[PDB]
Amino acid sequence: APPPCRCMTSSSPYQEFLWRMQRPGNIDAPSYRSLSKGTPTFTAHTHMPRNCYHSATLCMHANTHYWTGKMINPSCPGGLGVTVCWTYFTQTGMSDGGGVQDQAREKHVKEVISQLTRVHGT
């Protein structure tokens, strides 16, 4: 039901180098090995703060749900004004100050509470 994701890697290595150089806490220049090469492919981040996107929507790729949106800060992952994708859940024990990943986390735990209470009732 969600639309397919259109979240490709950087078209040029220079753009990837530029956005990875301006990330918070950057300490060293990224290596040329770590930069994406060849034809662009689907990519997804495992964490994204809420202050990087105005809004996020669900998308489907390989029968897996992802969040998609447009970045508003060059220091945010993916660059500036680039449509990027990130996972439905963030890393365990990690928070992004609200946002879609957190809202998914509380949604899942409340679903667990509801079904476990129903199990108790039975």
């Binding site: 997804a44 890393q91 365990t92």
Partner: protein
């Protein structure tokens, strides 16, 4: 009258315990005669706001207090003596952590929380995991923070870039600085700056006077906040009881896990640490506990060891009078290093998760889960729900399923408070042993 003098002397602790009791009663009354549904979300926010105000007041004080106290403590003692004292403190911290972890594993194996497992009750997707080596590199990076100002409000954490889902996933790791105070890096920098200041001389003397005066002013602010603290504790307890839904129904099958966690915490806090204190100092541990009641209740209300650190420092300073330098050097380090209750929680939770999925525990698995719990308790954040990330690292290291993590987050709100109480108690008891040792 003697009773009047007794209440006047112990007025704060009686106010704190009455505040805790009244918060429990008010939460039960509001939940029974209403709850989050009878009154709207705006009324719920207005009801729970004073506790948030207390938490913000306690969080405002942490940074200058920790920095100034550690600078003064490191600059007030010789480098060799400071190194020996730190070695003894770390030995005590790891010994207590191993004891708590072993007790938790033993209780979880004896009582079998996950034996029944109900009806599995797990699927949407799988949350991303963090590698063990990446977590240790993150800890080593948080030590010696790259930016001193940026470390005051945000900390480094590694993320991953899931590339080529159909194309032989590689999971390239990329790191960034995320929100959350970097306590450990500030602690390390303060200790190093203090020893450098002592190595300097008269210039170090001037800077020592500056930081000591700043610490004294911060203690005056702590004294002012400690009087408002009972109301915030009451409202925290009441709001957290009201917000959480359908009491008892959740516990009817989680009772074994809750009993394991709280019984381990109670045994470690009433039979292990007091025993160590009595065998090393020959004093009464329960007098120390009576002195430190209200930091313990503050920790229970706030569920954050960092938030209750100033109150614990003050109560250790005035009552059961540990000297200022040794207390102000020991308490900040243990507030981010010594976490016995957290380790016991993570061991019990991991064993319960393993028993949920019907997996063997053998011997080497138990040994490595104990070692990883101990080695990952250090460097964990003192914020509420700070043990979830370390538990996830433990689960990744032990090769256990992660999808049952939602059951741990289901009821962690109370046991996390118990963990905070145990951690601050371990801090205070370690300070007591070190003070008794330096008295001799």
């Amino acid at each position: 009258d003697q009773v009047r003098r007794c209440l006047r002397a112990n007025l704060l602790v009686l106010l704190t315990v009455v505040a805790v009791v009244a918060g429990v009663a008010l939460g039960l009354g509001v939940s029974g005669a209403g709850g989050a549904l009878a009154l709207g979300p705006e009324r719920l926010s207005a009801f729970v706001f004073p506790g948030e105000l207390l938490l913000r007041l306690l969080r405002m004080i942490i940074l200058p207090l920790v920095v100034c106290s550690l600078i003064g403590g490191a600059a007030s003692l010789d480098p060799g003596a400071l190194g020996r004292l730190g070695a003894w403190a770390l030995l005590f911290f790891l010994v207590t952590t191993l004891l708590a972890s072993a007790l938790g594993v033993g209780l979880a194996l004896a009582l079998q929380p996950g034996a029944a497992s109900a009806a599995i009750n797990a699927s949407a997707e799988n949350a991303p995991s963090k590698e063990v080596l990446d977590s240790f590199l993150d800890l080593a990076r948080n030590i010696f923070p790259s930016n001193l100002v940026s470390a005051a409000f945000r900390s480094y954490s590694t993320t991953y870039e899931e590339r080529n889902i159909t194309g032989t996933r590689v999971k390239v790791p990329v790191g960034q600085e995320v929100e959350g105070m970097n306590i450990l890096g500030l602690v390390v920098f303060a200790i190093v700056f203090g020893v450098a200041l002592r190595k300097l001389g008269p210039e170090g003397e001037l800077l020592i006077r500056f930081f000591n005066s700043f610490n004294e002013a911060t203690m005056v602010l702590v004294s002012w906040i400690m009087w408002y603290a009972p109301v915030g504790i009451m409202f925290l307890v009441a709001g957290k009881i009201v917000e959480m839904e359908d009491v008892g129904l959740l516990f009817a099958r989680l009772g074994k896990y809750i009993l394991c966690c709280l019984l381990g915490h109670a045994i470690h806090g009433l039979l292990v640490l007091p025993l160590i204190y009595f065998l090393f100092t020959r004093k009464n541990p329960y007098r120390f506990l009576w002195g430190i009641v209200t930091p313990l209740a503050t920790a229970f209300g706030t569920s954050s060891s960092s938030a209750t650190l100033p109150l614990m420092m003050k109560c250790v300073e005035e009552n059961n009078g540990v000297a200022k330098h040794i207390s102000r050097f020991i308490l900040p380090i243990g507030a981010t290093v010594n976490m016995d209750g957290a380790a016991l929680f993570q061991c019990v939770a991991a064993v319960f998760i393993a028993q949920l999925s019907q997996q063997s525990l053998d011997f080497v698995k138990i040994i490595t889960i104990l070692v990883t719990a101990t080695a990952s308790s250090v460097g964990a954040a003192g914020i509420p729900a700070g043990g979830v990330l370390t538990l996830a690292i433990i689960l990744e290291a032990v090769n256990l399923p992660v999808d049952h993590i939602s059951l741990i987050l289901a009821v962690d709100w109370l046991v996390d408070r118990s963990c905070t109480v145990l951690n601050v108690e371990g801090d205070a008891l370690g300070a007591g042993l070190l003070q008794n040792y330096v008295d001799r």
